Amino acid sequence: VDPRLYFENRSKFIQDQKDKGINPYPHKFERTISIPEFIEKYKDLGNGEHLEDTILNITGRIMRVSASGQKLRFFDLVGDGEKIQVLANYSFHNHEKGNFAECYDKIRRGDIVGIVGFPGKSKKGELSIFPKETILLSACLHMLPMKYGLKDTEIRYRQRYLDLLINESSRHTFVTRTKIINFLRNFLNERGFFEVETPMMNLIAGGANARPFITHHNDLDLDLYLRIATELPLKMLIVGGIDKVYEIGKVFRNEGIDNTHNPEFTSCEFYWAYADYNDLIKWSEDFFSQLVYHLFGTYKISYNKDGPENQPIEIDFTPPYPKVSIVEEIEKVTNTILEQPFDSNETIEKMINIIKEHKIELPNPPTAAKLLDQLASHFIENKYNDKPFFIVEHPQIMSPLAKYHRTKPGLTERLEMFICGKEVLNAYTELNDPFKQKECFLDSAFCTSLEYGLPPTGGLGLGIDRITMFLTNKNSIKDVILFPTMRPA
Amino acid sequence: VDPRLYFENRSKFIQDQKDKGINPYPHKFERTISIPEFIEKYKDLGNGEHLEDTILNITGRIMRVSASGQKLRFFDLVGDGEKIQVLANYSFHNHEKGNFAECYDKIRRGDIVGIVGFPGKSKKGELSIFPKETILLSACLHMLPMKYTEIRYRQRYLDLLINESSRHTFVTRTKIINFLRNFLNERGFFEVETPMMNLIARPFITHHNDLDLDLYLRIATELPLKMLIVGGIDKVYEIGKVFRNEGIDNTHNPEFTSCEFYWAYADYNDLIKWSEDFFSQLVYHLFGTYKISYNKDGPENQPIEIDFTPPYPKVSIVEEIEKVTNTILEQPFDSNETIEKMINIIKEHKIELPNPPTAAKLLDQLASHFIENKYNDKPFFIVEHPQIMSPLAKYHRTKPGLTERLEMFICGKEVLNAYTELNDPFKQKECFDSAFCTSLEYGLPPTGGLGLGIDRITMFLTNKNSIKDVILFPTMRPA
Ligand SMILES: COC(=O)c1ccc(OC)c(Nc2ncnc(Nc3ccccc3S(=O)(=O)C(C)C)n2)c1
Ligand SMILES: COC(=O)c1ccc(OC)c(Nc2ncnc(Nc3ccccc3S(=O)(=O)C(C)C)n2)c1
Ligand SMILES: N[C@@H](CCCC[NH3+])C(=O)O
Ligand SMILES: N[C@@H](CCCC[NH3+])C(=O)O
């Protein structure tokens, strides 16, 4: 019952073994079949059918120990997410290698073993390996949580291996996460896009609005910023003639941690020459509907927005998705005209007064771009929760790198897609006129590259961790990152 | 002639066009076919053959400007690394949309243009696009050079536009990583992401504000991946950036791309076989052969042939030093006698003494000058390094003081490092990271782990002598 006592006893057991000549951590084991291959090959045997002439070397982790007398031992063996039974019968044991009871009394839950034996099914129909010999390969010195015991704690996020061993759902979640990225990489590659890597470290951190991380470069004797986005170097590659380009990799933002914000997270940003806003809308609807159907065989999924203790909701990913113009909707909802320029003193005061009258938290500093973001969050960002939708046509002052709207003054051809009130996608027609970049006349290198001619371009960015959360029914981003950022305890 | 005046003149042209009601940066051109698709579908056209009844919308970048008389204007149009010619002929100019000379007088080398026209070949046989209308999509305000050395690194877009061997170099790099991803995926490996920032060579140090604690950029992915082996991901790998805050040279960058995999129940021969399978097939997948040419000493000097036909030689580091230097290195290798011996061979050859003169560094120095260039004929492995050079590698089964470590070399440059894991916690001297020793106590199976230097591999497979030439935006000293 005392985990400390269990550990010291197991430590003494390990030393007891090796001063008896037996190496409890042997060098190699010539495994011949894996547990998933074993299940695939022998799922068809009848109950009680033994294949005694087929000798297999199989490895796994013991997860359950029981017996029926000293001459019959039963175990669960797991590997690669799959499970078989171990049925050790005294009469099938290779007695030359050692005493049968001595061999199997040592096995504890969590032990990694290598088994030489034959496949079969028991009379109870459970597929089993029937050992002639089992060898300890790596002992589990600790009492593994007793199943359904890691259910909720910080041990899952720190000792993630325990989480993957005990909780069957977690492995499926991270398998789904890799299937998302594989689908996204295949989706883009099928359409001619070219994957690249751009520096994790730059003298500026552009391409988004976020506080960066600062680190020191010893060789260059210079302070660099961890990238907050891949946007600027990617658009420079468009200038270089890589007309379809993208990058899936980590970005860093040094701000508040919560259930949808992790200091480092995975983004996909692609840039698509000679495409525009309308292509990006079509791309987003094509990708999400195809991705959801790929994983589920349907466009409708369940998501526990208000936790697992409340009824879920249905998110329907059947395209098209609704589009809402941010300034128009805010003006309609608040019955107030936001007069241009949006960053005028009057309009800033008018936006604050709306925020004051509705008791919406005033952002710091109350800049026009942030005030508009707060009004959008409070008034439109939770309009649709049964389906995803786009907030579109953001003002130029919120979109410094987006092309000016081709018919609506003061706006851009920008789109953000939201699922259950969370942004997962940001895209727009790319501003390619160097003289219209207010920051030009901010990277000197990027602004200069614009002067060599950036073709009309559409670009898009994705939040992969947030996408994985909805597609795996998780309310916290820590549950889709293998080792989330954590305080030291 | 003066670049500053050219940029000033071109900038004024953009403003002059705006005042005239023309937008020099239009929002959307509905392209109908790409340049490579265009070359594919009309390469077999007859000379002088037109197809007037097929109108096509095409985009590209003007890379050359010329004119025959004044009613025929000749251009080079490049896109996706491929080129056609623009045949602007006054007869096929749609005058309803603008003056012929007015349109084509403005076009400068580097302009991104959109073209409405038909496909055909000229009399001389050069496949051409014949515009009815040509629209400026995005203008090149500077003069594009023709030849240009450090502009390549600071303005990679110019390199990608001008050199046409830079584009091949970085297409090869992506193909290398794609092959590696698919190679591991077909073998049942599972790709994951582990943190770049931890509480852990010299590190890069950053600070999170709200948490108010320092974080360190990972130097490798070894530790979290091995923890995932404990967690039951028996075949796991990650491809991504790692950071070592040291000096820059042709084969070391502080930020570089690594692949690490860990493979439960793999033994030493499994790791050797994986390496020989991967490198031989990757080379063959790229070139249709196992033998490549590589300029070891730059393009000025002679090139050598590297044969990637498996199997590769295996060399034991200690026994090979002993044979080449004609001494014996008695164990423990960190005894005052053997260290002083190794110091004395270093002095006798006037090789640089590593600071500090620790046993592992001296052994690395001896390997570098006596072993690591044993073969430039082919890749080869330096194997079975002492335990004191590899604190995480399992002990050798039969040879005292050694491990089952393997290190693969191309032209004296390390590109691969692997070994079987020391999974017994009571033999791990670090135990007696606390997060790692704890994970060992829950049971790490016998496992093989391998790491790959993607940048160095791409260098050799694109005939490059500097890591700067395979990184799109190498980190440069600013002004
Ligand atoms: C300041 O601004 C930030 O963004 C920010 C700040 C701090 C953070 O941690 C501490 C994160 N960390 C994160 N963690 C997972 N996801 C995302 N995404 C995301 C977040 C906000 C808006 C839009 C998006 S998004 O996914 O549409 C975009 C990537 C296309 N951010 C983001
Ligand atoms: C052990 O290294 C280091 O302490 C180190 C120190 C400084 C560096 O920059 C400043 C790098 N940066 C780098 N840049 C490109 N390539 C590589 N490779 C590489 C380098 C040395 C040994 C082995 C390899 S390797 O290709 O076998 C791969 C398995 C790591 N390292 C590595
Ligand atoms: N860089 C943007 C995504 C791409 C926007 C289109 N250029 C972001 O971080 O939100
Ligand atoms: N992390 C090692 C490669 C894998 C080591 C084997 N477990 C390196 O950077 O050289």
Numbering used by the authors:
A (entry chain A): 78 to 518, 535 to 582
B (entry chain B): 78 to 225, 230 to 281, 287 to 518, 536 to 582
The authors write:
Aminoacyl-tRNA synthetases (aaRSs) catalyze the synthesis of aminoacyl-tRNAs, which are crucial building blocks for protein biosynthesis. Lysyl-tRNA synthetase (LysRS) has been validated as a promising target for antimalarial, anti-Cryptosporidium, anti-Pseudomonas aeruginosa, and anti-Mycobacterium tuberculosis therapies. The ATP-binding pocket is the most promising area for the development of LysRS inhibitors. We determined five cocrystal structures of LysRS in complex with the compounds in order to provide a basis for further optimization.
Compared to compound 36, the methoxy group in the amino meta position of compound 34 is replaced by a methoxycarbonyl group, and the substitution position of methoxy group in compound 35 is different. As a result, the ΔTm values of PfLysRS caused by compound 34 and 35 were both lower than that caused by compound 36, and the potency of compound 34 against PfLysRS was weaker than that of compound 36. To understand how these compounds are recognized by PfLysRS, we determined the cocrystal structures of PfLysRS with the compounds 34, 35, 36, and 38. Most of the interactions between the compounds and the protein were preserved compared to PfLysRS-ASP3026. The methoxy group inherited from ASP3026 in these compounds were all bound to the hydrophobic cavity formed by Arg330, Glu332, His338, Asn339, and Pro340 like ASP3026. Similarly, the carbonyl oxygen of compound 34 also formed a new H-bond with Arg330. Among these compounds, compounds 34, 36 and 38 demonstrated greater inhibitory activity on parasite growth compared to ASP3026.
